Structures are given as C-alpha cells and as structure tokens.
Amino acid sequence: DRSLRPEEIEELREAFREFDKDKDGYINCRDLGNCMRTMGYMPTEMELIELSQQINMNLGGHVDFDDFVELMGPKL
C-alpha cells in the first residue's frame, strides 16, 4: 500500500550528519550542493539552489534533517 523509500532516509541521515558532524542539527545551503551531489549525484548545479532559497520562506538559510529530506524528495 503506497510504497515509498525508507532507504533514502538512512542514507540522508548519514549525509546530513557526515556533513553536520559539528552537532548543530542544521546545514547551510552551502554544504547542500556538496552534500546533495555526494548524496545521490543527480540534481543540477543551480536548481537545487532555488530550492534551498525557497527555504528562506521560513528559517533563512538553514535546513533541518526534515527540510533536508523535504528538499531531496522533490527532484531526484
């Protein structure tokens, strides 16, 4: 019934962390481009950007493992 992909969640967690080991729980749209590519190597090089920009409609350049996953769930 409605099959998703609970596997990417595990890989993301490691990427969101492997990049945010500082123990902050938040990453800057900067690492993303680098974490997004090393995470699946599939997005563009200026589009994932527009996404991390839309984020500004709430926090302001800071994504939580939740947005991180919400930003990688759209384009893949």
Residues in touch with Mg ion (CB under 5 A): 22, 24
Q: Which is nearer to Mg ion, 7 or 24 (CB)?
A: 24
Compute the distance between CA of residue 27 and CA of residue 1 in angstroms, rounded to an integer. 33
Taking the complex as a whole, the smallest distance from the CB of residue 30 to Mg ion amounts, in Å, to: 11
Cβ neighbours of residue 11 closer than 8 Å, sequence gap 6 or more: 39, 40
64 annotated ligand binder = no
Q: Which is nearer to Mg ion, 8 or 64 (CB)?
A: 64
Taking the complex as a whole, the smallest distance from the CB of residue 13 to Mg ion amounts, in Å, to: 15
41 annotated ligand binder = no
- Give the largest CA-CA distance in the chain: 38
20 annotated ligand binder = yes
Cβ atoms of 52 and 60 closer than 8 Å: no
As annotated, the binding site includes: 20, 22, 24, 26, 31
